[PDB]
Amino acid sequence: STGSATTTPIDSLDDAYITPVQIGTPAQTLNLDFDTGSSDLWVFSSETTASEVDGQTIYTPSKSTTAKLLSGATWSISYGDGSSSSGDVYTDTVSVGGLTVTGQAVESAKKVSSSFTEDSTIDGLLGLAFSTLNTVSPTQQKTFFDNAKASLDSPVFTADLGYHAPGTYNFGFIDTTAYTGSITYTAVSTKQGFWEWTSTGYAVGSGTFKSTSIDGIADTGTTLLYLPATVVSAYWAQVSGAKSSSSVGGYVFPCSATLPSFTFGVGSARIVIPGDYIDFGPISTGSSSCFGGIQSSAGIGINIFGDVALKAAFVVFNGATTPTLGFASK
Numbered sequence: 001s002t003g004s005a006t007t008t009p010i011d012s013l014d015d016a017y018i019t020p021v022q023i024g025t026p027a028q029t030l031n032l033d034f035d036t037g038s039s040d041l042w043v044f045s046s047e048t049t050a051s052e053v054d055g056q057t058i059y060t061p062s063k064s065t066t067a068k069l070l071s072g073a074t075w076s077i078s079y080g081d082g083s084s085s086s087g088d089v090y091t092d093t094v095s096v097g098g099l100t101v102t103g104q105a106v107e108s109a110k111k112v113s114s115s116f117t118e119d120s121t122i123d124g125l126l127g128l129a130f131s132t133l134n135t136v137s138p139t140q141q142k143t144f145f146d147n148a149k150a151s152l153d154s155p156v157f158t159a160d161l162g163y164h165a166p167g168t169y170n171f172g173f174i175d176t177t178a179y180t181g182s183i184t185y186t187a188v189s190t191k192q193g194f195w196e197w198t199s200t201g202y203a204v205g206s207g208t209f210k211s212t213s214i215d216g217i218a219d220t221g222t223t224l225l226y227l228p229a230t231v232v233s234a235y236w237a238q239v240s241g242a243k244s245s246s247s248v249g250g251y252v253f254p255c256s257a258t259l260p261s262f263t264f265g266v267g268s269a270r271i272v273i274p275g276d277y278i279d280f281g282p283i284s285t286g287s288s289s290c291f292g293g294i295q296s297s298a299g300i301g302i303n304i305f306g307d308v309a310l311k312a313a314f315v316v317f318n319g320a321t322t323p324t325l326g327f328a329s330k
């Protein structure tokens with residue numbers, strides 16, 4: 001079987017993308033943030049502390065005939081930006097773009113941090129990294145992808161995120177009409193539990209490609225592109241009004257400028273991010289200063305190929321026994 005769902009940016013800046021998910025019987029549609037940097041499927045629900053719920057849509061396990069409480073199981077997760085959530089777990093039918101999985105673990109939030117309450121458009125997250133990062137205790141639960149692998153026509157899922165436009169998430173098949181040229185695959189290390197790979201180098205604008213190993217993770221749940229401080233400094237050195245701003249927290253530049261492109265290597269292939277994808281947007285509505293899409297990963301402790309990077313390509317998350325990552329220009 002296969003599944004195909006449209007994913008849309010939550011705002012005009014492409015801060016995150018939401019994809020509709022059907023949970024329970026009859027189906028309860030929630031808009032989730034598909035995250036390749038985490039492994040938990042959690043949602044706001046009838047159990048979440050009332051005062052911590054904004055206008056998000058909640059899952060009511062009591063209204064679903066197929067919901068089953070997973071006795072004794074609890075969960076607690078903290079993300080890179082400091083947000084967190086926790087609760088109990090239920091198993092229920094979950095469908096994404098026509099692909100249905102039964103007995104999928106749906107983690108019910110009892111409490112959520114301030115940033116989640118504040119984001120009215122995100123109803124929860126759907127983890128797509130390796131099941132080893134799942135926070136359910138005492139026994140970890142499999143991700144939606146791991147549970148679907150048996151029925152998938154092919155153990156794969158593709159990410160085709162749009163630039164200021166909708167995109168698509170497909171499960172079990174590769175849409176040959178969605179990209180140009182051929183897909184180049186690169187090995188993945190599951191040691192840290194992420195979709196971890198090593199880039200072959202980079203190039204700024206129309207300059208020279210520098211062969212240097214860049215170990216990073218493909219994470220659809222992170223907005224920006226975080227690279228080593230020296231590579232980021234080399235990029236910004238090509239933008240005359242750009243500077244590192246301690247108050248804003250990163251490189252900023254005149255919205256006025258035409259940014260050079262940024263190329264990253266995948267084995268022998270090259271993925272080019274258009275300079276405009278690097279212009280995230282004004283620091284404030286009406287400001288003449290814009291926030292850069294490429295920032296230093298020095299403080300994160302790890303390089304992350306976020307949305308700004310991923311949206312410039314067609315990405316294939318190949319989940320076979322020995323997983324691999326494929327990238328194609330589009």
Ligand SMILES: CC[C@H](C)CNC(=O)CP(=O)(O)[C@H](CC(C)C)NC(=O)[C@H](Cc1c[nH]c[nH+]1)NC(=O)[C@H](Cc1ccccc1)NC(=O)OC(C)(C)C
Pocket residue numbers: 015016033035036037038039077078079080081082083119122125133135219220221222223224300
């Ligand atoms: C089991 C623990 C796992 C290893 C946790 N995994 C992670 O924290 C990585 P993630 O991709 O799952 C996680 C998902 C988010 C929805 C919280 N992303 C993050 O934690 C990163 C912050 C970060 C990561 N690393 C260093 N800093 N968040 C982000 O990148 C958020 C995403 C977002 C935007 C808008 C609305 C909702 C969500 N965007 C963001 O911060 O954008 C600006 C930099 C412009 C402010």
